[model samples]
Target: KVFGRCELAAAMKRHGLDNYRGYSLGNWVCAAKFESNFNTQATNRNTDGSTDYGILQINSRWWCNDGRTPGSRNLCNIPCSALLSSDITASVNCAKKIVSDGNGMNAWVAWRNRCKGTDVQAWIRGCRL
Candidate 1:
């Protein structure tokens, strides 16, 4: 599902992306914009032979099991299929684990390149968290 900016903001916030890992809600929202454009079923096959799944682009190499990706560790202990759901529950929970594991928001390149050190607050200007 392709969600509007505000729609995604509300969903992610409901799952506690806001103020998570010392990053603002918009930081994650902005990462999702660049990573998957709010499409829950998005997938990015990286050169490393791993696929990044879902709106936040969790990786098959380390995060989720896809029944492929030769070295998948399934660190998040979830099937990659769960990331493709519109619910965003598993996606947000996995994101939290990724951060807590010391990967932090830097786990996502889009976060560093786009959301980091920027006024991402504007990404959710009207969401009124």
Candidate 2:
């Protein structure tokens, strides 16, 4: 099972994030790799900065630690680690919304178009969606 990297990438290409969700799993994963080496359970101890969690590197304690939403410990109310290991599509859908707020697929498109390791917002220009 070539799970996380390629398989998940293909799944995201199929569902996308703009129309129904917000961010892109690819984008988030890329950022997360730089941030946490793709560790889904990665958590930061820096009290001054942000603390991200899960594969998407979402700030779980910031967004869900309070248990506000049903997915307080996961994505779209589903478990974070489970989304990555079991359901790549759900992870992509949920992560898309988390980054873009439903407007776009966030940075994954640009990252996919070979726009990563640079300014994501500036590259956000050509895409219509």
Candidate 3:
């Protein structure tokens, strides 16, 4: 499920994440681009045997449960499949919970390593709302 940048930007704003947790819309979009290329179905197996899920690439080790990963804490209390949907409301809500828990966007390697302090203005270029 490939999502247009503008579509994602609009959706994130609708979800109220544009300014959530002190992060800007540009930061969110940039991080999403690197994390999953805005694909809700994206999943990545980590070296530690955990997996990342959704547009945000949230980790199963601490956030969601895929029913395959053992000892998953499910801190977000969302099923892994929920994050794999084209509708991102569940994933967005879970992300908010994650950030509110104190890790911030630092919990996302994509944000920390790529979008943290970089100029991300291009992410929202021509995007409406």
Candidate 4:
């Protein structure tokens, strides 16, 4: 599903990502905007022979198992396909693990390049709750 800006923000908030790991909801919102444009089915094949799945672009290399990444750790212990579903429960859970593991928001290059150091508050403008 492709969510509206605020729609995705609301979803993340409900999942406890609003300020998870010391990052603001707007930071996650900005990362989502650049990562997959809020599309649940989004995927990206990385040059490192791994695939990033879903809205948060959870990677098969480290987070979810896809049975193809040579570096597959399945650290999140969930199938990569689960991240592609309309339900973001798994995605949010795995993303939390990523943060808990010390990657923080910098786990995503899009976040480092596009959201870091910017006024990410713009992402939540007029986004109530």
Candidate 5:
């Protein structure tokens, strides 16, 4: 009955973000807290009055303007809206690339390392599903 959590979680699972389940959840939560304070529509203001927008707090100048697609925008499009308004699992994936550069961790794993200490092997063994 909750809004968006199902879809978001499904997306995570679909993308192997939840291959280890618990650890990945930890990673996702950690990344969310660090990146956007868990605020999907979080925004940042520049002193000159231009703004950065959306939950991941993507910058407008690079993401939606000047002819470049912020990775987040390239995948999700709503740079100015709350993350819940977009595909959050995709957002998590985006965060993963930023944190681990696509080689270190899928978004969930990075979030896990961030939240539960970096013992990835142990975390994986303890993970459910």
Candidate 6:
């Protein structure tokens, strides 16, 4: 589902994206903004022949089954369509699993290129939580 900024932040925090992998809440929220604009149904085709899925944009190549995509690792054992649901439970769980691999937030190229070294507090500028 499409979420407003503060609502998105609350969901991310509920899923523990805040302070994940030794990074700040801003890091995760900023990454989500750049990656998918907090769009749960977002999908993008990468030049490398993969699709990025969900709010966090977990990749089809290593994370989820997109049905059409061959050789999906699907380590999270979830369908890529699952990530598109309004309920973010599957997406959040998968994201946590990905970060737990020690790749950290750098796993998302958007995080590396955009959110890194920036003052991401603007991502949650008026959030009450």
Summarize candidate 6's per-residue lDDT along 1-129 as a digit string, tens digits: 788888988888887888877877788888889888989999999887889999999999999988766766889999999999999889989988998887788899899999998999888788988
The C-alpha stretches of model 2 lying farther than 4 A from their native spots are 1-4, 17-29, 46-51, 66-86, 102-129
RMSD of each: 1.0, 7.7, 1.1, 0.9, 7.0, 1.3
Provide TM-scores for the models.
0.96, 0.45, 0.94, 0.96, 0.41, 0.92
TM-score of 1: 0.96
Model 2 earns a TM-score of: 0.45
Quote the lDDT for 30 in model 3: 92
Give stretches of model 4 more than 4 Å off: none
Which rank order by TM-score, best down to worst?
4, 1, 3, 6, 2, 5
Whole-model Cα lDDT of every candidate shown, in order: 0.91, 0.45, 0.89, 0.91, 0.45, 0.87
The parts of candidate 3 lying over 4 Å away from their true place are none
Per-residue lDDT of candidate 5, residues 7-106 (tens digit): 4344555666663433455454344455456556556665544455444444544333313323323333433343335545535554444445343434
User: Which wins on TM-score, candidate 3 or candidate 4?
Assistant: 4
Candidate 5: worst 10 consecutive residues by lDDT? 63-72
Instruction: Name the lDDT value of residue 128 in candidate 1.
Output: 59
Q: What tens digits encode model 1's per-residue C-alpha lDDT throughout 24-119? A: 888889999999999999998999899999999999999999998996799899999999997899999999999888768888988988888999
Q: Write the per-residue lDDT of candidate 2 for residues 61-95, one digit (tens) a residue.
A: 43434233333344356544443353455445566
Clash number for every model? 0, 7, 0, 0, 4, 0
What alpha-carbon RMSD in Å does predicted model 1 have with respect to the real structure? 1.0
**Clash pairs, model 5 backbone:** 27-111, 27-112, 40-55, 40-82
Candidate 6: Cα lDDT at 125 = 86
